[PDB]
Design an enzyme around this catalytic site. Structure first.
Site, PDB file in Angstrom:
ATOM      1  N   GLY A  17     101.747  44.410 -20.503  1.00 14.88           N
ATOM      2  CA  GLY A  17     100.277  44.509 -20.506  1.00 14.88           C
ATOM      3  C   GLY A  17      99.712  44.910 -19.149  1.00 14.88           C
ATOM      4  O   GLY A  17     100.420  44.857 -18.123  1.00 14.88           O
ATOM      5  N   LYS A  35     104.338  38.070 -14.039  1.00 12.42           N
ATOM      6  CA  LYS A  35     102.953  38.432 -13.746  1.00 12.42           C
ATOM      7  C   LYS A  35     102.881  38.880 -12.294  1.00 12.42           C
ATOM      8  O   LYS A  35     103.284  38.147 -11.389  1.00 12.42           O
ATOM      9  CB  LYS A  35     101.997  37.256 -14.024  1.00 12.42           C
ATOM     10  CG  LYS A  35     100.530  37.506 -13.546  1.00 12.42           C
ATOM     11  CD  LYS A  35      99.753  38.429 -14.489  1.00 12.42           C
ATOM     12  CE  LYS A  35      98.325  38.626 -13.952  1.00 12.42           C
ATOM     13  NZ  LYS A  35      97.542  39.648 -14.687  1.00 12.42           N
ATOM     14  N   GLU A  72     107.771  31.937 -18.709  1.00 12.33           N
ATOM     15  CA  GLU A  72     108.386  32.129 -20.023  1.00 12.33           C
ATOM     16  C   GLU A  72     107.665  33.295 -20.732  1.00 12.33           C
ATOM     17  O   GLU A  72     106.452  33.518 -20.534  1.00 12.33           O
ATOM     18  CB  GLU A  72     108.336  30.838 -20.878  1.00 12.33           C
ATOM     19  CG  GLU A  72     107.205  29.923 -20.502  1.00 12.33           C
ATOM     20  CD  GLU A  72     107.101  28.618 -21.332  1.00 12.33           C
ATOM     21  OE1 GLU A  72     108.004  28.290 -22.136  1.00 12.33           O
ATOM     22  OE2 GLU A  72     106.092  27.912 -21.137  1.00 12.33           O
ATOM     23  N   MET A  74     106.163  35.026 -23.834  1.00 15.97           N
ATOM     24  CA  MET A  74     105.555  34.709 -25.109  1.00 15.97           C
ATOM     25  C   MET A  74     105.552  36.016 -25.890  1.00 15.97           C
ATOM     26  O   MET A  74     104.808  36.942 -25.571  1.00 15.97           O
ATOM     27  CB  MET A  74     104.151  34.107 -24.905  1.00 15.97           C
ATOM     28  CG  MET A  74     104.196  32.797 -24.127  1.00 15.97           C
ATOM     29  SD  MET A  74     104.790  31.511 -25.231  1.00 15.97           S
ATOM     30  CE  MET A  74     103.305  31.185 -26.177  1.00 15.97           C
ATOM     31  N   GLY A  77     102.364  38.085 -27.486  1.00 17.33           N
ATOM     32  CA  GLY A  77     101.351  38.748 -26.673  1.00 17.33           C
ATOM     33  C   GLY A  77     100.067  37.928 -26.580  1.00 17.33           C
ATOM     34  O   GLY A  77     100.080  36.712 -26.804  1.00 17.33           O
ATOM     35  N   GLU A  78      98.966  38.598 -26.257  1.00 16.49           N
ATOM     36  CA  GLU A  78      97.669  37.914 -25.985  1.00 16.49           C
ATOM     37  C   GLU A  78      96.862  37.774 -27.251  1.00 16.49           C
ATOM     38  O   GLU A  78      96.899  38.677 -28.098  1.00 16.49           O
ATOM     39  CB  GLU A  78      96.797  38.773 -25.101  1.00 16.49           C
ATOM     40  CG  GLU A  78      97.266  38.998 -23.716  1.00 16.49           C
ATOM     41  CD  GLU A  78      96.356  40.002 -22.999  1.00 16.49           C
ATOM     42  OE1 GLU A  78      95.365  40.564 -23.594  1.00 16.49           O
ATOM     43  OE2 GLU A  78      96.648  40.237 -21.836  1.00 16.49           O
ATOM     44  N   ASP A 117      88.441  29.787 -16.805  1.00 16.22           N
ATOM     45  CA  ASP A 117      88.479  31.195 -17.238  1.00 16.22           C
ATOM     46  C   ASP A 117      89.110  31.291 -18.618  1.00 16.22           C
ATOM     47  O   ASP A 117      89.967  32.146 -18.853  1.00 16.22           O
ATOM     48  CB  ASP A 117      89.251  32.080 -16.227  1.00 16.22           C
ATOM     49  CG  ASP A 117      88.968  33.603 -16.429  1.00 16.22           C
ATOM     50  OD1 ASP A 117      87.898  33.986 -16.934  1.00 16.22           O
ATOM     51  OD2 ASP A 117      89.847  34.395 -16.092  1.00 16.22           O
ATOM     52  N   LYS A 119      89.604  32.528 -22.177  1.00 12.86           N
ATOM     53  CA  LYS A 119      89.228  33.734 -22.912  1.00 12.86           C
ATOM     54  C   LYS A 119      90.464  34.197 -23.693  1.00 12.86           C
ATOM     55  O   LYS A 119      91.594  33.755 -23.402  1.00 12.86           O
ATOM     56  CB  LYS A 119      88.679  34.847 -21.984  1.00 12.86           C
ATOM     57  CG  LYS A 119      89.621  35.276 -20.877  1.00 12.86           C
ATOM     58  CD  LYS A 119      88.864  36.055 -19.744  1.00 12.86           C
ATOM     59  CE  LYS A 119      89.897  36.680 -18.779  1.00 12.86           C
ATOM     60  NZ  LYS A 119      89.273  37.345 -17.602  1.00 12.86           N
ATOM     61  N   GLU A 121      92.231  36.752 -23.579  1.00 19.00           N
ATOM     62  CA  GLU A 121      93.271  37.395 -22.765  1.00 19.00           C
ATOM     63  C   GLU A 121      94.206  36.374 -22.152  1.00 19.00           C
ATOM     64  O   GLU A 121      95.348  36.711 -21.838  1.00 19.00           O
ATOM     65  CB  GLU A 121      92.657  38.251 -21.657  1.00 19.00           C
ATOM     66  CG  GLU A 121      91.803  39.403 -22.216  1.00 19.00           C
ATOM     67  CD  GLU A 121      90.287  39.071 -22.318  1.00 19.00           C
ATOM     68  OE1 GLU A 121      89.868  38.022 -22.873  1.00 19.00           O
ATOM     69  OE2 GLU A 121      89.500  39.912 -21.842  1.00 19.00           O
ATOM     70  N   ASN A 122      93.720  35.133 -22.023  1.00 17.43           N
ATOM     71  CA  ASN A 122      94.487  34.037 -21.409  1.00 17.43           C
ATOM     72  C   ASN A 122      95.079  33.061 -22.396  1.00 17.43           C
ATOM     73  O   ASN A 122      95.553  32.004 -22.007  1.00 17.43           O
ATOM     74  CB  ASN A 122      93.594  33.288 -20.416  1.00 17.43           C
ATOM     75  CG  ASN A 122      93.385  34.066 -19.187  1.00 17.43           C
ATOM     76  OD1 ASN A 122      94.211  34.960 -18.852  1.00 17.43           O
ATOM     77  ND2 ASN A 122      92.315  33.734 -18.453  1.00 17.43           N
ATOM     78  N   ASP A 138      96.855  31.469 -16.797  1.00 20.31           N
ATOM     79  CA  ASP A 138      95.923  31.899 -15.747  1.00 20.31           C
ATOM     80  C   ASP A 138      95.050  30.807 -15.141  1.00 20.31           C
ATOM     81  O   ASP A 138      93.908  30.543 -15.595  1.00 20.31           O
ATOM     82  CB  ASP A 138      95.085  33.082 -16.220  1.00 20.31           C
ATOM     83  CG  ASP A 138      94.096  33.525 -15.167  1.00 20.31           C
ATOM     84  OD1 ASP A 138      94.287  33.221 -13.961  1.00 20.31           O
ATOM     85  OD2 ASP A 138      93.110  34.158 -15.577  1.00 20.31           O
ATOM     86  N   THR A 157      73.193   4.202   2.585  1.00 20.46           N
ATOM     87  CA  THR A 157      71.752   4.096   2.297  1.00 20.46           C
ATOM     88  C   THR A 157      71.152   5.509   2.475  1.00 20.46           C
ATOM     89  O   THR A 157      71.410   6.153   3.501  1.00 20.46           O
ATOM     90  CB  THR A 157      71.065   3.094   3.266  1.00 20.46           C
ATOM     91  OG1 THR A 157      71.759   1.833   3.236  1.00 20.46           O
ATOM     92  CG2 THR A 157      69.573   2.830   2.905  1.00 20.46           C
TER      93      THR A 157
HETATM   94  C1  LIG Z   1      99.352  33.185 -14.523  1.00 23.00           C
HETATM   95  C2  LIG Z   1      98.480  34.405 -14.889  1.00 23.00           C
HETATM   96  N1  LIG Z   1      97.518  34.840 -14.044  1.00 23.00           N
HETATM   97  N2  LIG Z   1      97.211  34.304 -12.953  1.00 23.00           N
HETATM   98  C3  LIG Z   1      96.249  34.838 -12.193  1.00 23.00           C
HETATM   99  N3  LIG Z   1      95.622  35.955 -12.583  1.00 23.00           N
HETATM  100  N4  LIG Z   1      95.950  34.316 -11.014  1.00 23.00           N
HETATM  101  C4  LIG Z   1      98.677  35.140 -16.090  1.00 23.00           C
HETATM  102  C5  LIG Z   1      97.594  35.810 -16.696  1.00 23.00           C
HETATM  103  C6  LIG Z   1      97.763  36.546 -17.870  1.00 23.00           C
HETATM  104  C7  LIG Z   1      99.032  36.626 -18.463  1.00 23.00           C
HETATM  105  N5  LIG Z   1      99.482  37.253 -19.571  1.00 23.00           N
HETATM  106  C8  LIG Z   1     100.786  36.960 -19.667  1.00 23.00           C
HETATM  107  C9  LIG Z   1     101.690  37.532 -20.763  1.00 23.00           C
HETATM  108  O1  LIG Z   1     102.852  37.161 -20.894  1.00 23.00           O
HETATM  109  N6  LIG Z   1     101.128  38.574 -21.393  1.00 23.00           N
HETATM  110  C10 LIG Z   1     101.684  39.326 -22.363  1.00 23.00           C
HETATM  111  C11 LIG Z   1     101.091  40.579 -22.631  1.00 23.00           C
HETATM  112  C12 LIG Z   1     101.636  41.408 -23.621  1.00 23.00           C
HETATM  113  C13 LIG Z   1     102.756  40.988 -24.341  1.00 23.00           C
HETATM  114  C14 LIG Z   1     103.471  41.565 -25.318  1.00 23.00           C
HETATM  115  C15 LIG Z   1     104.455  40.726 -25.653  1.00 23.00           C
HETATM  116  N7  LIG Z   1     104.381  39.614 -24.901  1.00 23.00           N
HETATM  117  C16 LIG Z   1     103.344  39.747 -24.075  1.00 23.00           C
HETATM  118  C17 LIG Z   1     102.808  38.901 -23.084  1.00 23.00           C
HETATM  119  C18 LIG Z   1     101.195  36.190 -18.643  1.00 23.00           C
HETATM  120  C19 LIG Z   1     100.109  35.952 -17.886  1.00 23.00           C
HETATM  121  C20 LIG Z   1      99.939  35.224 -16.705  1.00 23.00           C
END
Ligand SMILES: C/C(=N\NC(=N)N)c1ccc2[nH]c(C(=O)Nc3ccc4cc[nH]c4c3)cc2c1
Ligand SMILES: C/C(=N\NC(=N)N)c1ccc2[nH]c(C(=O)Nc3ccc4cc[nH]c4c3)cc2c1
Lengths: 280, 280
Positions: A17, A35, A72, A74, A77-78, A117, A119, A121-122, A138, A157
């Site tokens: 991503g 990340k 790890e 996932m 995805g998101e 945060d 959302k 996406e997270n 995130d 006081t």
């Molecule tokens: C720890 C973190 N961000 N931290 C900060 N921005 N400071 C963060 C944010 C968004 C994230 N997204 C993912 C993640 O594994 N995303 C993802 C995106 C697309 C696919 C497709 C298959 N597995 C996926 C996982 C890890 C991750 C970590």
């Protein structure tokens, strides 16, 4: 190039991503997600100490030209990609995912952490199956609760103390409610496929929509959603942060009293885990 | 016992007033004051970087069983001792001291520092003469302004953002006004010999007195004080922090347009300084 210490342990691969890369841990030949944050220390310390099945775990960290957070993977995805372009989840799927978001955020607030945060996406999904585990990620904007300046102020006081500080006492200690509001917006989107507050075909500014609490309600989209689900949304999208539902209140709501949903989550947890033998 | 590194450089002496001790720097045989704080790092970093004639200077620091902050000795002691037990200063003396407090706090706010504990105990006098320099001390509760979480929040679209955060925007960035309120209370006390808000012979709680802004006005005490001095007090003891006078506004007030007072301060500054020769 990737930093040598990262290369030493991992083989880097395709973009999933900021960017997220697939990589393989050399030791195990298993997949991880990496990340990359372009130039966090607090986020790492937070991630290291948290331990919940619905919160992403950190595996490694490299502070180099950029930051590399190894997590790890996932596979699903998101959540964003499941709800974008007006796509919407079956109500049962919404409930399974929302229950887990509530467990995760309840665990954060119990542990004195506000995410700030939340959302789609997270929110990460554990597989491409609809029934799957979710994990929040995130912690880049997250805040750690502790003893406040305010608390120390109130020990003396207030002879010299400004009225605005005494006024702030009425509302102090509800900063965690911002996560419940974001949860409410997530739930609104998952159930309906459209955001409650936006500038699409309306004259009212986004700010005004939000501070008034007047979400865009479209009956036709909502007719197929249950009354209970919408009732929860309404209790989360409450403008007064002291009156807004907490995660405990949301977990007690009728919509979440769903034996079948809870069974599914328990089954999915069991399937995820690789435990050792135990006594008896 | 005192820590060895402190003993190496200083001979410790009598208690002046936490404790404050008189000591002699061995190198110079000159007097210093040593503030002992029982078990600050930020306070030291603040004190080291500030450079104003009305802000106390740090000379040394020892982090041992207790903290030891070595400071210049202000022979006149604390302002508190000049106003305690209903004692009150001549209006001219109030003006000379208040002008300097205003210069000091103006310098703090220009430099992104809020003091947050201004009170007579933290105002030091340079001599036992009435006409003297004053220096503010104690940055133990002080806050350093920088880019806020709020600023970063406002850079994105508030799709998921809670209404209370958007509400907070109207009042953000006025935290420095708490120092102006404390200044107002100091000025009230210096001019009158009694605090504006207290529980002495009244039914109204201290909190209510303060948030309503309704100070205790006793005409008989105030009859000998000028209208201009009281007018300044009133502009500082304003409940709305956005409407409250800033240090710049206070420095422009009629009460402070006093050529003779300003001359005295300039003369006192000149007398304090030990400069080198200079070109031309
Ligand atoms: C720890 C973190 N961000 N931290 C900060 N921005 N400071 C963060 C944010 C968004 C994230 N997204 C993912 C993640 O594994 N995303 C993802 C995106 C697309 C696919 C497709 C298959 N597995 C996926 C996982 C890890 C991750 C970590
Ligand atoms: C830096 C500081 N406190 N910091 C913290 N509490 N964190 C502080 C506070 C109050 C103070 N008071 C003084 C000071 O010199 N006080 C004093 C008290 C009595 C006499 C009598 C003659 N000269 C005096 C000076 C230094 C000082 C430093």
């Amino acid at each position: 190039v990737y930093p040598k210490a990262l290369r030493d342990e991992y083989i880097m691969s395709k973009t999933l991503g900021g960017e997220v890369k697939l990589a393989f841990e050399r030791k195990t030949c298993k997949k991880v997600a990496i990340k990359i944050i372009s130039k966090v220390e607090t986020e790492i310390e937070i991630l290291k100490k948290l331990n919940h099945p619905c919160i992403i775990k950190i595996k490694n960290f490299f502070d180099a030209e950029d930051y590399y957070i190894v997590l790890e993977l996932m596979e699903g995805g998101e959540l964003f990609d499941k709800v974008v372009g007006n796509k919407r989840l079956k109500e049962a799927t919404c409930k399974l995912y929302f229950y887990q978001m509530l467990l995760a955020v309840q665990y954060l607030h119990e542990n004195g952490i506000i995410h700030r945060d939340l959302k789609p996406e997270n929110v990460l999904l554990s597989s491409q199956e609809e029934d799957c585990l979710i994990k929040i990620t995130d912690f880049g904007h997250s805040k750690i609760l502790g003893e406040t300046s305010l608390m120390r102020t109130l020990c003396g006081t207030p002879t010299y103390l400004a009225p605005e500080v005494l006024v702030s006492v009425g509302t102090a200690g509800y900063n965690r409610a911002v996560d419940c509001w974001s949860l409410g917006v997530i739930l609104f989107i998952c159930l309906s496929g459209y955001p409650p507050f936006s500038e699409h075909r309306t004259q009212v500014s986004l700010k005004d929509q939000i501070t008034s609490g007047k979400y865009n309600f479209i009956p036709e989209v909502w007719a197929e959603v249950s009354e209970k689900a919408l009732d929860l949304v309404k209790k989360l999208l409450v403008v007064d942060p002291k009156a807004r539902f907490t995660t405990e209140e949301a977990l007690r709501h009728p919509w979440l009293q769903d034996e079948d949903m809870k069974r599914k989550f328990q089954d999915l947890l069991s399937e995820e885990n690789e435990s050792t033998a135990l006594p008896q």
